[PDB]
Amino acid sequence: GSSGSSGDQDTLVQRAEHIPAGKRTPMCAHCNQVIRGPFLVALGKSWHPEEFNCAHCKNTMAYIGFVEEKGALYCELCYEKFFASGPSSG
Numbered sequence: 001g002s003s004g005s006s007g008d009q010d011t012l013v014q015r016a017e018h019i020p021a022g023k024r025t026p027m028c029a030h031c032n033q034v035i036r037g038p039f040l041v042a043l044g045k046s047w048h049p050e051e052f053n054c055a056h057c058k059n060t061m062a063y064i065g066f067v068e069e070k071g072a073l074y075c076e077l078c079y080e081k082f083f084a085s086g087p088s089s090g
């Protein structure tokens with residue numbers, strides 16, 4: 001065996017594990033309905049790859065990342081936009 005318990009610093013932006021069909025048929029979080037096909041497991045729960053969308057830009061948050069805040073998922077874009085308030089030309 002070996003030892004670890006060590007890691008590097010990274011951004012909060014988390015991701016969802018794309019689960020294939022057949023593997024498992026958990027219960028969605030939004031609609032709360034048994035999933036037959038592939039689902040996304042994140043935040044300690046499952047969701048539909050068709051509904052799973054941002055809270056502001058309501059965009060597909062399957063590939064891109066997302067950040068939770070007081071019960072709200074914000075894609076890296078939204079976050080970096082609000083959170084990481086960089087310099088504004090105007």
Ligand SMILES: [Zn+2]
Nearest residue numbers: 028030031048
């Ligand atoms: Zn659903």
Ligand SMILES: [Zn+2]
Nearest residue numbers: 054057075078
């Ligand atoms: Zn967004």
